[PDB]
Design an enzyme around this catalytic site. Structure first.
Site, PDB file in Angstrom:
ATOM      1  N   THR F   1       0.831  -1.197   0.000  1.00 56.95           N
ATOM      2  CA  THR F   1       0.000   0.000   0.000  1.00 56.95           C
ATOM      3  C   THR F   1       0.866   1.248   0.000  1.00 56.95           C
ATOM      4  OG1 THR F   1      -0.367   0.681   2.324  1.00 56.95           O
ATOM      5  CG2 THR F   1      -1.348  -1.393   1.611  1.00 56.95           C
ATOM      6  N   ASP F  17      -1.138   3.031  -5.164  1.00 57.84           N
ATOM      7  CA  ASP F  17      -1.522   1.757  -5.738  1.00 57.84           C
ATOM      8  C   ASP F  17      -2.868   1.344  -5.164  1.00 57.84           C
ATOM      9  OD1 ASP F  17      -0.635   1.196  -3.131  1.00 57.84           O
ATOM     10  OD2 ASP F  17       0.568  -0.527  -3.719  1.00 57.84           O
ATOM     11  N   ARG F  19      -4.683  -1.661  -3.913  1.00 56.25           N
ATOM     12  CA  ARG F  19      -4.888  -3.001  -3.378  1.00 56.25           C
ATOM     13  C   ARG F  19      -4.899  -2.928  -1.862  1.00 56.25           C
ATOM     14  NH1 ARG F  19      -0.944  -7.913  -4.850  1.00 56.25           N
ATOM     15  NH2 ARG F  19       0.346  -7.052  -3.164  1.00 56.25           N
ATOM     16  N   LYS F  33      -7.413   5.078  -2.880  1.00 53.25           N
ATOM     17  CA  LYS F  33      -6.742   5.579  -1.693  1.00 53.25           C
ATOM     18  C   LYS F  33      -6.588   7.088  -1.712  1.00 53.25           C
ATOM     19  CE  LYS F  33      -4.010   1.444  -0.865  1.00 53.25           C
ATOM     20  NZ  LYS F  33      -4.423   0.725  -2.087  1.00 53.25           N
ATOM     21  N   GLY F  47      -1.853   2.669   6.331  1.00 53.05           N
ATOM     22  CA  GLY F  47      -2.021   2.171   7.679  1.00 53.05           C
ATOM     23  C   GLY F  47      -3.290   1.361   7.813  1.00 53.05           C
ATOM     24  N   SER F 129       4.159   0.958   3.646  1.00 56.18           N
ATOM     25  CA  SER F 129       5.369   0.143   3.599  1.00 56.18           C
ATOM     26  C   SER F 129       6.150   0.428   2.327  1.00 56.18           C
ATOM     27  CB  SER F 129       5.013  -1.337   3.683  1.00 56.18           C
ATOM     28  OG  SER F 129       4.328  -1.746   2.519  1.00 56.18           O
ATOM     29  N   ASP F 166       7.379  -4.894  -3.697  1.00 54.66           N
ATOM     30  CA  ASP F 166       6.837  -4.822  -2.357  1.00 54.66           C
ATOM     31  C   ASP F 166       5.643  -5.756  -2.289  1.00 54.66           C
ATOM     32  OD1 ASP F 166       7.009  -3.270   0.300  1.00 54.66           O
ATOM     33  OD2 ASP F 166       4.886  -3.148  -0.229  1.00 54.66           O
ATOM     34  N   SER F 169       1.911  -4.505  -2.669  1.00 52.96           N
ATOM     35  CA  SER F 169       1.802  -4.019  -4.033  1.00 52.96           C
ATOM     36  C   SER F 169       0.351  -3.702  -4.371  1.00 52.96           C
ATOM     37  CB  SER F 169       2.365  -5.045  -5.004  1.00 52.96           C
ATOM     38  OG  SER F 169       2.218  -4.604  -6.336  1.00 52.96           O
TER      39      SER F 169
END
Lengths: 216, 196, 204, 213, 203, 220, 200, 196, 202
Positions: F1, F17, F19, F33, F47, F129, F166, F169
């Site tokens: 994320t 992104d 997901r 987002k 978060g 992350s 990542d 993702s």
């Protein structure tokens, strides 16, 4: 675990048409205290293989005396037969898995690389024994930060000249100077090619603090 | 660690408690009867923590008894069961979790007999037969093997004696007497206690 | 865990102007099945079914609480509820009790009450809207009901194909689980019918 | 104080037909939230007729393949006879059990084919319990691939489709779609599955990519 | 995190480093731990990050309302006093070792220290932060008495250069701010402006 | 994320992104987002997936109540300070590492909000992350005072560098471009991740079911 | 897992289910949870799928060594006793198992019960497993020593049918064994669903 | 949680166990007899941990049985009691604490009958009557009220039936049958088991 | 506890403070953390107290036996090497951040650091102890290059004066020891000999 061990932060490396270059900063950080500045974390072994260390440095001195003693010992049998970087990677893997298997583990997390007879090699050996091969590696927070710049260029072209790889790891090392807290300015860059292992230390990072005066 | 059992008939539902009031190592007076008399046709049972059985379910008896002798008619056992599920479920997480698990035998006149069931978390579900305690773990298959959906009264009583003689044979606690009440369309009856 | 107390597993998926919500008729303690009939697919509108899973006292608690606030909402302003708005309302029911939350993940399946454009949604514990045009999955055995029903669902399906695929996804999903299953239930929501059906499962 | 295991992920599948055993794989080994590499096989060619899959903690998977490889060689010229498949399953059951009290945290699947030629596949918990099957993927997307080929291979909860035996075309197309589905839905995806497939004449190894994210 | 503040003569000279680490990752390479609260009085901030600027704009509220209530410029002792109260009453929830400075018209140069436990002392030089333990020898040895503005400017500059050189949780550009009668004259030191010191080699 | 945002000469470019992965499985493969607050202020979110939603519905609603109380367009400093003060007094129990940016009467600028309530004025930010996977591509190829098109390409390369290495993702990149005059909230910018394809049809018709009891109910 | 065993005038029935959980996700619907240590005895398994499989595997080795060494069929009390010795001397190490050791010998039908704590008791009937007490109830309602063969089979099928119906951690199939003075035989591989349609 | 009892007569000592082999929730086969046959005249009993009773006391049976069928005569029960106290007491703290508490009925020919007693810590003491388990806590006063130091055999048996009917009435565990053995100067003689 | 050791030229100059605190009580106001191990090589000792001098006389045993076995004066690298081994092998039981110095005849001035984890590096100046975190700025700023014996004597003197002034677990007299070719010339600084620095008053 029991004490503030003396650590490093990152040994990041990339292979290239030619050989393989790995780079690390000289830092002996005693838990948010740069207690040791001029401290080499790049081991030379026999002329076609190299070795780094990211975690505990005392365990890296243990590994530099057992790797050093092993490679001079099998070096003086004569009959050719030096270690390909197959065998340093595999021996270091079995040493660490046989070391955590008794719960007395080595805490450093290195990358060994070297140019064999045909092609280069860049292998990762973890604290736990998680060992593999990769076109480009980074240890510690470099595995979060230097690793995107490495597996971006190498997804575009998986072929690098020596100056492109050397500037690539110089730029990644500058990024770890910017973001990683346990990182120091000067660093050893170190390349093994057809002519052998050579270590060019220490270098510096041209810092860009020009965005600082836009803060209010 | 006590034992409550019930079987829903076609026009009745019979419940039986274990007639043992326990302690640390010993047992107290046997009788202590766990089946709490509701209005005329509802009858709930309560085991679990020693001190919330006599407290919570008697408070439910106060509110339902107040509903009947406040507004004429009594509750159907559906509204009494969802009432005590609401009261236990909102007395659950707040300050003092009432650790009781209830059976609620009952019947309305113009619908069938119902045997409601809930855990100590107040999750309610109908059941043709339900059980409680540790003694639930071994006796419930005998009500799986023999219980037809339509069963006569004396066949259900001797089936209940099969369940209690198995519970007498294998289950490690001394439960020698059991209090049995059949409720049906003439009001709460009481069958003769089963002893050994 | 505490989500693995009563088991439970609901899902919902859409093709053409029908949706399909499906639960598993099972309720009990971790090892024990105290009953087989257990209402998990709660009707709210005529063509808007909410389906809940997880801890059973929370699914009856916010099922009846959601019937309270929903019923009072359509009484305060006379119309059938728009289902996106009901997604927002369970989003502000699971939330605001964030501290010590409800242990449920309600999915919401149905139709727009005037254009009949289907959608399906899912929420987490504390309430986050996952609008979805493919399929949603809730319960303990999540990734099976994923996984497999991501491997089955094609777009733009009439009710007999959607019928068949949510039947297979539920049966082979909850068969590969311990604390779920034992006879499942499928509601097809067409633009004229509610094909309510049960399915004889591996009841063991 | 140390936590000697991590979960490096990876999902590996094997299907037993009637003269073959499709031992699938994935590639991406990764722990925490950063991936390490995208080259790493997880199906290992033990003999010409036995292929292991090996998922879980990667270092202990690796040492376990070294042990079962070196003891296969220790068998082979102690009796002048190669291993069978069920004997591989048995000695790997006692290797996994032999270190129980600090166990091999690894989910491994042994494909391959029997003495008569029909394919078999042995599944394992990380302490050692072998059952022969015709499916059962294992290790990261264990609970994701399993209900599909409970249905499209075992034909369970399914009426009279007049089910045919599998082959190297129906089961070949049944491995790629489940790993693009788990490439969508699992996090420990894999970017390029390397299906070590076993047959009567020998062994080949098809590779095709996935969702690379 | 390293803060210096030296009362030279008449006014003061501040100084702060610039990193905001999330343990072992610089989340903000360029932050100003110097912040104004009224006009001349500046507070710095160390330790944690979220609590201390809630304290900073809380006392911008209280100090600004008090200063407009008196129609006079407030003393630095006022702001450090409500730092003693505002940080003392919430002492088990806040990691805020702020050290403040400014020029009141009444007294002159004042530098107060409000450490982590929450109190108020007046000091000639103050010091506080993560790296502000590696330079007590240098600041204790070099600071003589009654220094001027340019030599406290370079004194704070190379003291913070030592502390950013040796700490790992402290680095980047350093910000100086010389509070005086004619207002703040702040500047930054961008890279080469840092007085880099030689490291001893061969070894 | 992973999440990112870059200021440039006209404005800002956010980006995320799409997901949301509860546990270690994606619950939903396409979620916004980049949340609305205001016609000149978009925030972001990382978060806890629900806490960012509720904190930006609350600051969105309270902020546009504030703006239509003032009458003028709302500034982006007051969004920073309402997120800071309202997100601080819950002691960091809300995990909402969100960034927010805006073009204003003062100038286009963006802030980052850590979940304990620490705010940073920056030219470029990364929460989540995927921060680590998308910060280095702001350190080799970021330049101050840069034109809109290679800033859009920059943020797409950053989020695209948070996709490929990542495990938080996303499926596809969506990014908003907030300029002085126009807002460009564009959903997905690039889709570097196709579904693939299936092979072989599966079902019969009115078979492959164990129907126990049907029930039909008409509606109209 | 829900095993079951009971002796009567014709040998002893040993029945068991066929599922093998992994906490909540379940691995197999067909597990051979009866170990055939020789064609005269048996042995079951009731949890810790590698523990029980290893220790009845090793019991098969030790009892075969007894067959070679003392040229007699092993008595069932010897096999249960030495099992209780070895899993006794791994007590406290997290070992968790439990089993029947049935089988005809030169004195009786056998049926000893050996578990991880080292109980090692004789019996007339048992049913060890996860739920398994359900099995106790229904088995002990229809059990008598004076049964013939067929309603003993139906007593086992109904017994662990209900014990797999009510329990969650059980099910799959049911295999059934009737050992007597020739060795074990197999009489069933039925699953739960065909028993459900068989018996309504 | 089992129950062992013994009463020393003037020329005998009688012991009785509870004839219940327990489990987690259920009870297994009743018989499982806890009284382990020693040489001819010694007889010890063992409860406690399920798995050390059948292990330790059988090992003591091996060593004492080896002493008798190695050197002619048998042990007096004093030397057998101090023998098993030594073996439990030095197997106590080392690596595996045998959590068993023993009774040891016995008699020598040229001295009286003796009923030795020990806890799980292997602290040994003679007793005219001793008990074990949780059932020891309520039944021991009935052997306080009625036990004379000189008592006939049938009076001690019906006294033992008083103790077992009290243990049947108050103690919460289902202990329906009890195995009784009187040992005296003709060898180990066992009375018919008491049931209810 | 604060230790300094500066390689000036040819030989070295040591320095150590003198306290032995039991948490918050000076159990020994006057101790010598300087200690000889052979003749020229001195080891210091920091951190704990009981383990580190068991290490010190253990390596007096091994280094003395080795030196009499060779009939040559041993190198400082020898002693620091068996400090790396003796402290490394017992690393989870020892808190011994010793930093050693001496004049071997072969090389010259050598100062090695064996920190708490247990390793060996060569440094120009070394530093280690409890208070030896308060003077990295002063020692990092003042030490220039190639200094002489008297200015490393006063350099170590006032560096340790800063560290004993600011630490609470460090104080008392400080001991200097200048290892050179002509043997050790050690002395103490008794009170007024400490270079007291003025405190600013606010």
């Amino acid at each position: 675990t029991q004490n503030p061990m003396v650590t490093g932060t990152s040994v990041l490396g990339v292979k290239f048409e030619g050989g393989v270059v790995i780079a690390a900063d000289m830092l002996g950080s005693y838990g948010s205290l740069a207690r040791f500045r001029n401290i080499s974390r790049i081991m030379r072994v026999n002329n076609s293989t190299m070795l780094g260390a990211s975690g505990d440095y005392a365990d890296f001195q243990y590994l530099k005396q057992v790797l050093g003693q092993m490679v001079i010992d099998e070096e003086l049998l004569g009959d050719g037969h030096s270690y390909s970087p197959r065998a340093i990677h595999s021996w270091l893997t079995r040493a660490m898995y046989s070391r955590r298997s008794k719960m007395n583990p080595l805490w450093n997390t290195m990358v060994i690389g070297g140019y064999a007879d045909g092609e280069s090699f860049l292998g990762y050996v973890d604290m736990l024994g998680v060992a593999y091969e990769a076109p480009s590696l980074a240890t510690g927070y470099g595995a979060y930060l230097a690793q995107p710049l490495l597996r971006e260029v190498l997804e575009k072209q998986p072929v690098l000249s020596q100056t492109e790889a050397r500037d690539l790891v110089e730029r990644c090392m500058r990024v770890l100077y910017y973001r990683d807290a346990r990182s120091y300015n000067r660093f050893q860059i170190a390349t093994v090619t057809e002519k052998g292992v050579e270590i060019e230390g220490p270098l510096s990072t041209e810092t860009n603090w020009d965005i600082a005066h836009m803060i209010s | 660690m006590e034992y409550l059992i019930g079987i829903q008939g076609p026009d009745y539902v019979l419940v039986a408690s274990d007639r043992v009031a326990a302690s640390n190592i010993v047992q107290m007076k046997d009788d202590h009867d766990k089946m709490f008399k509701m209005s005329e046709k509802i009858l709930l049972l309560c085991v679990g923590e020693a001190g919330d059985t006599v407290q919570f379910a008697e408070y439910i008896q106060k509110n339902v008894q107040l509903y009947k002798m406040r507004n004429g008619y009594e509750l159907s056992p559906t509204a009494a069961a969802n009432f005590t599920r609401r009261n236990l479920a909102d007395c659950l997480r707040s300050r003092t979790p009432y650790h009781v698990n209830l059976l609620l035998a009952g019947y309305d006149e113009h619908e069938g007999p119902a045997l409601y069931y809930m855990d100590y978390l107040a999750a309610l579900a109908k059941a043709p037969f339900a059980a409680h305690g540790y003694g639930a773990f071994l006796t419930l298959s005998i009500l799986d093997r023999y219980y037809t959906p339509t069963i006569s009264r004396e066949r259900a009583v001797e089936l209940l004696r099969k369940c209690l003689e198995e519970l007498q044979k294998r289950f490690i606690l001394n439960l020698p007497t059991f209090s049995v009440r059949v409720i049906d369309k003439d009001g709460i009856h009481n069958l003769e206690n089963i002893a050994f | 865990s505490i989500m693995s107390y009563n088991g439970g597993a609901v899902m919902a998926m859409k093709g053409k102007n029908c949706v399909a919500i499906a639960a598993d008729r099972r309720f009990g303690i971790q090892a024990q099945m105290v009953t087989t009939d257990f209402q998990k697919i709660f009707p709210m509108g005529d063509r808007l079914y909410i389906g809940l899973a997880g801890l059973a006292t929370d699914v009856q608690t916010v099922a009846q609480r959601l019937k309270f606030r929903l019923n009072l909402y359509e009484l305060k302003e006379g119309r059938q509820i728009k289902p996106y708005t009901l997604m927002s309302m369970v989003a502000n029911l699971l939330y605001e009790k964030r501290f010590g939350p409800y242990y449920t993940e309600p999915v919401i399946a149905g139709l727009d009450p005037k254009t009949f454009k289907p959608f399906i949604c899912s929420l987490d514990l504390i309430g986050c809207p996952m609008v979805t045009d493919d399929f949603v999955v809730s319960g303990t055995c999540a990734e099976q009901m994923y996984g497999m029903c991501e491997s089955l669902w094609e777009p733009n399906m009439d009710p007999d194909h959607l019928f068949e695929t949510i039947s297979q996804a539920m049966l082979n999903a909850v068969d590969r689980d311990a604390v779920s299953g034992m006879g499942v239930i499928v509601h097809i929501i067409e633009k004229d019918k509610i094909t309510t059906r049960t399915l004889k499962a591996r009841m063991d | 104080r140390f936590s000697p295991y991590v979960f490096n992920g990876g999902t590996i599948l094997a299907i037993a037909g009637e003269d073959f055993a499709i031992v699938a794989s994935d590639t991406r080994l990764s722990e925490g939230f950063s991936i390490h590499t995208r080259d790493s096989p997880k199906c290992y060619k033990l003999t010409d007729k036995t292929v292991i899959g090996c998922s879980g903690f990667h270092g202990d998977c690796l040492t376990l393949t070294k042990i079962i490889e070196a003891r296969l060689k220790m068998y082979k010229h102690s009796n002048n006879k190669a291993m069978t498949t069920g004997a591989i399953a048995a000695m790997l059951s006692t290797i996994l059990y032999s270190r129980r009290f600090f166990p091999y945290y690894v989910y491994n699947i042994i494909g391959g084919l029997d003495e008569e030629g029909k394919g078999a596949v042995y599944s394992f918990d990380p302490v050692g319990s072998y059952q022969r099957d015709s499916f059962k993927a294992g290790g990261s997307a264990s609970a994701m691939l399993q209900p599909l080929l409970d249905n499209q291979v075992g034909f369970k909860n399914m009426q009279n489709v007049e089910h045919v035996p599998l082959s190297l075309d129906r089961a070949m197309r049944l491995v790629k779609d489940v790993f693009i589905s788990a490439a969508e839905r699992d996090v420990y995806t894999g970017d390029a599955l390397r299906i070590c497939i076993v047959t009567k004449e020998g062994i080949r190894e098809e590779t095709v990519s996935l969702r690379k994210d | 995190t390293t803060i210096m503040a030296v009362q030279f003569d008449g006014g003061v000279v501040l100084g702060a480093d610039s990193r905001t680490t999330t343990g072992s990752y610089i989340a903000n390479r360029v932050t100003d731990k110097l912040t104004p609260i009224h006009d001349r009085i500046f507070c710095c901030r160390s330790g944690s990050a979220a609590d201390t600027q809630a304290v900073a704009d809380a006392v911008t509220y209280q100090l600004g309302f008090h200063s407009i209530e008196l129609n006079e410029p407030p003393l630095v002792h006022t702001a450090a006093s409500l730092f003693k109260e505002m940080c003392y009453r919430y002492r088990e929830d806040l990691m805020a070792g702020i050290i403040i400075a400014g020029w009141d018209p009444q007294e002159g140069g004042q530098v107060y220290s409000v450490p982590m436990g929450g109190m108020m002392v007046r000091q000639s030089f103050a010091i506080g932060g993560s790296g502000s333990s590696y330079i007590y020898g240098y600041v204790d040895a070099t600071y003589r008495e009654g220094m001027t503005k340019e030599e406290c400017l370079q004194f704070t500059a190379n003291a913070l250069a030592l502390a950013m050189e040796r700490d790992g949780s402290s680095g980047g550009v350093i910000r100086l701010a010389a509070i005086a009668e004619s207002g703040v004259e702040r500047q930054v030191l961008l890279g080469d402006q840092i007085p880099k010191f030689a490291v001893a080699t061969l070894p | 994320t992973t999440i990112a945002g870059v200021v440039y000469k006209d404005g800002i470019v956010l980006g995320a992104d799409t997901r949301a992965t509860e546990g270690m499985v994606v619950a939903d493969k396409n979620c916004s987002k980049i949340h609305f607050i205001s016609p000149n202020i978009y925030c972001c979110g990382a978060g806890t997936a629900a806490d960012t939603d509720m904190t930006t519905q609350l600051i969105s609603s309270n902020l546009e109540l504030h703006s239509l109380s003032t009458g003028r367009l709302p500034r982006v400093v007051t969004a920073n300070r309402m997120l800071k003060q309202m997100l601080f007094r819950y002691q960091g129990y809300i995990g909402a590492a969100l960034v927010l940016g805006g073009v204003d009467v003062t100038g286009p600028h963006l802030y980052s909000i850590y979940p304990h309530g620490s705010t940073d004025k920056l030219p470029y930010v990364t929460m989540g992350s995927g921060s680590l996977a998308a910060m280095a591509v702001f350190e080799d190829k970021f330049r101050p005072d840069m034109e809109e098109e290679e800033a859009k390409n920059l943020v797409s390369e950053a989020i695209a560098a948070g996709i490929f290495n990542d495990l938080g993702s996303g499926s596809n990149i969506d990014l908003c471009v907030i300029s002085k005059n126009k807002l460009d909230f564009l959903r997905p910018y690039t889709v570097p991740n196709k579904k693939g394809t299936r092979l072989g049809r599966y079902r019969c018709e009115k078979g492959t079911t164990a129907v126990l009891t049907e029930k039909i109910t008409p509606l109209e | 897992t829900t095993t079951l065993a009971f002796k009567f005038r014709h040998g002893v029935i040993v029945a068991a289910d066929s599922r093998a959980t992994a906490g909540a996700y379940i691995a197999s619907q067909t597990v051979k949870k009866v170990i055939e240590i020789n064609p005269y005895l048996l042995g079951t398994m009731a949890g810790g799928a590698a523990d029980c499989s290893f220790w009845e595997r090793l019991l098969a080795r030790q009892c075969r060594i007894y067959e070679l060494r003392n040229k007699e069929r092993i008595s069932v009390a010897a096999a249960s006793k030495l099992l209780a010795n070895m899993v006794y001397q791994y007590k406290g190490m997290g070992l968790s198992m439990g089993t029947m050791i049935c089988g005809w010998d030169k004195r009786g039908p056998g049926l000893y019960y050996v578990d991880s704590e080292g109980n090692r008791i004789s019996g007339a009937t048992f049913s060890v497993g996860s739920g398994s007490v359900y099995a106790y109830g229904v088995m002990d309602r229809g059990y008598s020593y004076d049964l013939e063969v067929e309603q003993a089979y139906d007593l086992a099928r109904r017994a662990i049918y209900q014990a797999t119906y009510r329990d969650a951690y059980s099910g799959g199939a049911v295999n059934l064994y009737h050992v007597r003075e020739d060795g074990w035989i197999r009489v069933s591989s039925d699953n739960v669903a065909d028993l459900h349609e068989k018996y309504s």
